[PDB]
Design an enzyme around this catalytic site. Structure first.
Site, short mmCIF file in Angstrom:
data_model
loop_
_atom_site.label_atom_id
_atom_site.label_comp_id
_atom_site.label_asym_id
_atom_site.label_seq_id
_atom_site.Cartn_x
_atom_site.Cartn_y
_atom_site.Cartn_z
N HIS A 1 0.82 -1.22 0.00
CA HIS A 1 0.00 0.00 0.00
C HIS A 1 0.86 1.28 0.00
CE1 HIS A 1 -2.27 3.24 2.28
NE2 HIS A 1 -3.02 3.09 1.20
N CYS B 1 0.30 37.91 -16.67
CA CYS B 1 1.39 37.78 -15.71
C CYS B 1 0.92 37.54 -14.28
CB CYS B 1 2.32 39.00 -15.77
SG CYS B 1 1.52 40.53 -15.29
#
Lengths: 899, 899
Positions: free
Chosen positions: A478, A851
């Site tokens: 796991h 930006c």
């Protein structure tokens, strides 16, 4: 006859085919596809969606659907050999729903008392197992096919666990389970009126009817609302023969990966167990065997093992079951060749005979995906175009993970070894359960988590901890899986580690919340905690992907950067200029701060003008410093943004005394300080506003630029500066500033006798600018979208103050995600949409860019592509992500417009 | 022949007519119209625009245009009797340009040496006048028709004023002027090559050519840019016979108003002078005579005069020149009947013969316009519709001016009397020149200005001063005129006042910057400075106009008001509900402030809930208080807007001690105070944001409402509340709050067992809301446009901080006007435009309104009408203005859609 309600699969032939996802659901089409393909999938049949629909609108199963199901069971029987319902050679089914688009699954259908206490008295090594499965199945049955709860079997189970004194099912014995089952049998014959169906065929139809019921299900009628695929028919049903690798010692189950999900390297990675139910493979108890010979040889060479040991103790499918590994090797090649991608495989050799139970495009780490992709390009399996698409921009950050440096022999200290489960290296104090680590993260402390084995309840702490180290588990452990699910460096299956309290003893040494380290090399250490940025990233590996990305990208990727240190870092990921270089900083830190402090005071405009020619060269110098970084490349510079009140103290004594003449103490300080103070500074006097009341600034700035600008030009290079004006709101707000800069610029050009090409343009951050974008176009040369600022005004959010509630909004789900991270497409975007169109109506060839933080966010980038922007600008360490995300959007589009 | 280049007018017939504004320009069409009308206008002819064009594209005047001009002069000669260029009976022209749309004007064309020193030696009372006019004309000629400056005649004039020792032309004598002229004659024959044209006909053409030149003029080619009526042809030219009322003692000039420009009353108001050049009428030296008999009788009855005095000293046109007053009375009726409006008239009786020189729709005070309008409705001259349009909303404020109360006999003190030049009454310390008053305004001081006579250079101080009082001047006195131009109460022509330094002696008493008062009753006083608001405004006079406005209005006019005192004031101007009742105030002033201060602290939500049921009834009570005002009418209430940090001090000690239990001093004060502090409070935690983190508030508020709401209902009345949610930005931001109020409301309704009809809706103040207006519609019941807030976010202006620059913007002309006063139609409006359309797409019958300061601004209102809003909301004392402005927009539209 006429109709055909049921579709056999298995005989290597299979009625249906990979095209009828409409009738057979995806699982059913897929299965069909698979067997026609020639791979050994356990047989069974599919029950068409039409069948499903016929059940919703009347609670019946047509006689010809019955007949038809019986027709095929007798085919499955033939194929496998067993007999459905015959306790001597029994055949068991699995019943599952047809449609990947989400209703559940039943194993061991066909179990009944006779078949059980005849299977036991027939091979009693597995007496424990049979009853386990029967009680399991009896429960699955009543829950799902009878809808009668579980709180009851659950209770009577645990009531039986306390009677024997453990907390685990693992300890209950054959005798216990039999008891369990027998009480279950009557507990069933009570909770409902009837007794448990011994007739395996009634059991079968019951199964079917319950799947068709799980479709009209309220927990499911919702499904079709907010998944919204309306008009489906219903769901298919997939009946399928069960198989086992715990039958004898010529039986096995295993799990395998056509290529390494960690390194990515092209070898056959896997794990198996003879006479074992897969579960045992994952479980980690009893060392998992490698499928491939080479691979065993090296696992062994990297533990204390010699050949004559592994040979008889921990062999290798390749030599234990060579016949079959040879064939499982074929199948591996077969499916990779078909799906064009790394597969992972679940298999089972029942009595010498190989079966493939499950097969999926395999998850992998980012490193791996990068490798395999390149390889399959070379191998001819996929195009470069296709390659690129198999790389996630969200994961490209995972390549920015630290690993060790040769400071691993600076001093040794590997006081342990495990699996190289997940790439990377991690330092941190240790902690011993989900909640331990849930905590030390928050004290600023980075944590390594140690658990014997992990599980979906060790999960919250799992993505908290900087590293994971388990006592047991294969590559299928796991912890292993999930670690690669997050590229969180992991070492597992270290069985030397003995865990007790918040301590554990790693052969020789003992430990407790001290400072450790782990690696993808798979060794536990005790620091050597000088990690390193893998910044010379992926050795032209990833760089190749970037090249490709560069070739299919439409959008330019520029950088947000104001240090040349930050300029050249970003450039050398192939950024193509700066979309934002902010000039505030060359007013602040260091010598500069003082002389601006002088200007703002100078009670005289002709005064300040001197306080200016002061700063000409300190900046001019910082500008060659930047222009030098981007030679050949464009650089956009945002003239001074903010208000003067951020360049001043409150009280300081030191300032007024550098001073001028008398009539001047420390409350012509407090004048213009509480005089320049604002309520909402954000929307105060700044940007253009400021550069029009006091213009000479934007002039100093503008020459500081074009001075530095012409200088660099001389030095054998070429340079293009993009003068940007912050905060513009109205067509004429800008129109003035324009000739106000074209003055300073055209002066420096004339005086210097030498030419250089500049462009004046504006931030689009005020909503009004967006809406009036058409008129603003006439005075501009480009747009940068200030979506940060533009979101604050657009939304009415003062970012630094939205703490108390934004986090809350995220929960109840107003905004799906902090709109300061990813653009509000519905609203803020519309504003942008509006701007882009109006502006281009006027200047059709207008340069437009974006930006800030949104600049590096993929989803936003993809939006920017659609909307028509020319470039995107992001921080240096996103340049990569952006480049991908871009080429990624461009790629999707090229394909869409081809149909 | 064929073409016709010149259009005679005068013979009572007149070639052209009122339709050819294309050929004759507006002045020329008008003239024509006038004479066809039958009114005695001094003759002349018009020179068509075509003539003008033919001159621009070649510097020529066609021979047939010459011939043609000569043809008409000989017609003017015939008509008047004189002879152009004949020194025995000379005829003089005025030459002026044809096109009201803006090039100048020349008097006494036709003057030459012969004509002059033969006119003098022929009637030498006027020897002074002739030379005055000649030197005047010689100058006008060279300046305009020769473009040779004036700095030269100006100099040689003043060089002659110092030689005699005054500063005034008024003192120069016949002998001086003759000298002046004679030097002008050679000064001309120098500055240019030739001597002054004795040939009056050359003089004429020169005139004409110079008018055509004044059209291509650079100072004028600009005109057609930013006036933009492109494609005009050129300009007409209007030549016209000169006339004089200083010929003898059966000559006069005067100025008259078909109705009083102050009271508005229907009488023939005027002023004239026998043997006088109008100039003398304005001048004020030598008392002006009333034209009408009654009117003289009463001017006299309101000064020290007895009948036998006025009879021989200050008669009355009515009895001095009765023949002509009878006729001037006819003309008055004639033109009012034609133009449907109060006219004012300039006239001249040259030698018994009446001429009307100028006639214009007359300016008037607001009071006057209100009267005349009503009268002409009644009289049948104009429609109620038309009436309304002749009332300016910008001036409706002028009805809010104070006048005295019977406290004028509380004590007497009229130490002077003048003209009732401009309605009103004014208190204030006095000052004696434009700059005096330019100043005391700014010290908070209200000022009365006293000047012998005023003038266009006493002007800046004129609109500064609260009142004006002059020593001389008729109803045509400069001060008089301009005062009505601003409805600034004025008393003029008080010749008792003797002015010296910053003092003046009003018969008996002497004064200096002390405190005075003046009135429209026309009496100087010394305070009785208890003015009164004429709030029971215009006695059903204006109220009638409002009725009418109410009948043509489309937009509803609601009020912005949160005191019932403010509710009922506004209602009783016929406001039709409230568009904004803000609930902050019932948290602040008085007992309330404390118990909110308790809530914000209560570290416990179940805690505050108690700190709430505290405030239930203090507010609930303030709500009947409001709901009681507007019975039958809608009331919109904006739930708590702002952040909690405005309900807290900084330091106070008094608060923490009302207190709860221990573990609590004065820095769990400073916690949540600097904890609740924000950077940009404007865009912080408030409105809906606040009402979702802490909901129970909006619930207390909501019941406080519906409790008060159901109460009033019982009391024989009906009431409809409109619950408004501030600051909503996203469709779901609102969707929650909605059922969050429909909860509280539907609870109070259920518990009370009695029903009342509420509606939930939102402010549109965030830009995003505008853009996403369609989705926001689905959860709303109305929109109020928060154009104040919406302008701040829309524009990026923190209103309280825009001081430093906005004022500056106004100057260079970015925004034509503070967009916080009148809507930015180009931008902020577009946002609104967008909102209104998207919203109505969804709910087509959505109620939409606007509020705040823009609510009362006409221009904005007119915009709101066009755009489709349903109502407007404004402060009480704008209700009137708005009502007008509304009906005003509705009226314009009804007419536009009828063509």
């Amino acid at each position: 006859v006429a109709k055909k309600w049921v579709y056999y699969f298995g005989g290597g032939n299979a009625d249906g085919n990979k095209n009828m996802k409409e009738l057979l659901g995806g699982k059913g089409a897929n299965l069909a596809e698979m067997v026609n393909l020639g791979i050994p999938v356990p047989p069974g049949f599919t029950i068409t969606t039409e069948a499903c629909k016929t059940y919703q609108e009347t609670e019946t199963i047509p006689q010809e659907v019955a007949d038809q199901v019986r027709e095929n069971v007798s085919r499955v029987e033939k194929e496998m050999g067993a007999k459905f319902g015959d306790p001597a050679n029994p055949l068991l089914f699995s019943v599952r729903s047809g449609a990947a688009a989400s209703m559940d699954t039943v194993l061991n259908l066909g179990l009944n008392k006779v078949t059980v206490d005849a299977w036991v008295r027939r091979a009693p090594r597995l007496e424990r197992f049979v009853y386990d499965s029967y009680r399991r199945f009896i429960t699955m049955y009543a829950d799902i096919v009878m809808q009668v709860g579980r709180e009851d079997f659950e209770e009577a189970l645990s009531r039986m666990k306390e009677r024997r004194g453990t907390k685990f099912d693992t300890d209950l014995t054959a005798s216990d389970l039999k008891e369990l089952c027998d009480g279950y049998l009557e507990l069933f014959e009570l909770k409902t009126g009837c007794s448990f169906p011994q007739d395996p065929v009634m059991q079968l139809f019951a199964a079917i009817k319950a799947v068709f019921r799980s479709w009209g299900n309220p927990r499911a009628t919702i499904y079709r609302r907010m998944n919204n695929i309306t008009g489906l028919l219903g769901t298919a049903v997939n009946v399928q023969a069960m198989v086992f690798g715990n039958i004898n010692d010529r039986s096995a189950t295993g799990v395998a990966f056509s290529r390494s999900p960690s390194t990515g390297e092209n070898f056959f990675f896997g794990e198996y167990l003879v006479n074992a139910q897969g579960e045992d493979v994952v479980a980690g108890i009893r060392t998992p065997q490698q499928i491939n010979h080479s691979l065993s040889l090296r696992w062994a060479k990297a533990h204390g093992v010699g050949e004559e040991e592994r040979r008889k103790r921990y062999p290798s499918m390749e030599e234990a079951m060579p016949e079959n590994y040879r064939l499982l090797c074929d199948v591996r090649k077969r499916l990779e060749n078909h799906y064009r991608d790394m597969q992972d495989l679940e298999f089972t050799v029942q009595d010498g005979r190989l079966w493939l139970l499950q097969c999926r495009n395999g998850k992998r780490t980012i490193h791996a995906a990068v490798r395999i992709a390149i390889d399959m390009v070379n191998e001819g399996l996929i195009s470069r175009e296709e390659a690129v698409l198999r790389i996630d921009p969200y994961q490209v950050d995972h390549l920015m993970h630290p690993n060790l440096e040769p400071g691993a022999e600076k001093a040794n200290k590997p006081i342990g070894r495990g699996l190289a489960a997940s790439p990377g290296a991690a330092v941190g104090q240790v902690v011993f359960d989900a909640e331990s680590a849930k905590e030390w993260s928050g004290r600023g402390k980075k944590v390594i988590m140690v658990r014997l084995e992990t599980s979906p309840e060790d999960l919250a702490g799992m993505d908290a901890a900087c590293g994971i180290l388990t006592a047991r588990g294969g590559m299928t452990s796991h912890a292993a899986v999930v670690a690669r699910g997050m590229g969180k460096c992991c070492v597992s299956g270290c069985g030397d580690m003995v865990i007790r309290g918040k301590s554990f003893k790693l052969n020789g040494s003992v430990f407790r919340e001290g400072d450790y380290i782990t690696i993808d090399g798979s060794k536990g250490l005790i620091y050597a905690g000088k990690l390193k940025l893998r910044s010379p990233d992926l050795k032209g590996s990833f760089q190749t992907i970037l090249q490709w990305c560069q070739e299919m990208k439409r959008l330019g990727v520029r950088t947000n950067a104001d240090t040349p240190a930050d300029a050249a870092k970003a450039r050398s990921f192939g950024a193509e200029g700066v979309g934002l270089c902010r000039t505030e900083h060359m007013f602040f830190e260091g010598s500069r701060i003082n002389f601006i402090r002088e200007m703002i005071l100078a009670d005289s405009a002709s005064g300040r003008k001197a306080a200016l020619d002061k700063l000409l060269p300190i900046q001019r110098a910082d500008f060659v410093g930047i222009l030098r970084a981007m030679r050949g490349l464009p650089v956009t510079i945002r003239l001074l943004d903010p208000p003067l009140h951020e360049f001043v103290p409150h009280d300081a004594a030191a300032q007024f005394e550098l001073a001028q003449k008398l009539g001047m103490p420390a409350e012509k300080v407090r004048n213009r300080v509480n005089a320049l103070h604002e309520l909402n500074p954000m929307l105060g006097h700044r940007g253009c506003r400021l550069g029009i009341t006091y213009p000479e600034i934007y002039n100093m700035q503008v020459r500081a630029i074009i001075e530095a600008a012409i200088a660099v030009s001389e030095e054998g290079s070429s340079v293009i500066p993009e003068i940007m004006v912050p905060l513009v709101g109205k067509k004429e707000e800008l129109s003035l500033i324009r000739e106000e800069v074209v003055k300073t610029a055209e002066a420096v050009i004339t005086k210097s006798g030498k030419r250089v090409h500049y462009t004046v343009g504006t931030m689009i951050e005020v909503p009004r600018a967006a809406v009036t974008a058409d008129s603003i176009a006439q005075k501009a040369d480009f747009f940068s979208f200030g979506t940060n600022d533009l979101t604050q005004m657009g939304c009415g959010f003062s970012r630094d103050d939205a703490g108390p509630f934004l986090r809350h909004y995220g929960n109840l789900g107003i905004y799906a995600q902090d709109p300061f991270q990813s653009i509000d497409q519905e609203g803020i975007g519309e504003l942008v949409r509006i701007a882009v169109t109006k502006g281009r109506r006027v200047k059709p060839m207008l340069k437009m860019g974006i930006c800030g933080e949104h600049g590096g966010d993929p989803a936003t980038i993809g939006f920017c592509h659609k909307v028509g922007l020319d470039y995107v600008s992001c921080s240096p360490f996103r340049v990569p992500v952006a480049i991908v995300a871009a080429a990624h959007a461009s790629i999707k589009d090229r394909r869409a417009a081809m149909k």
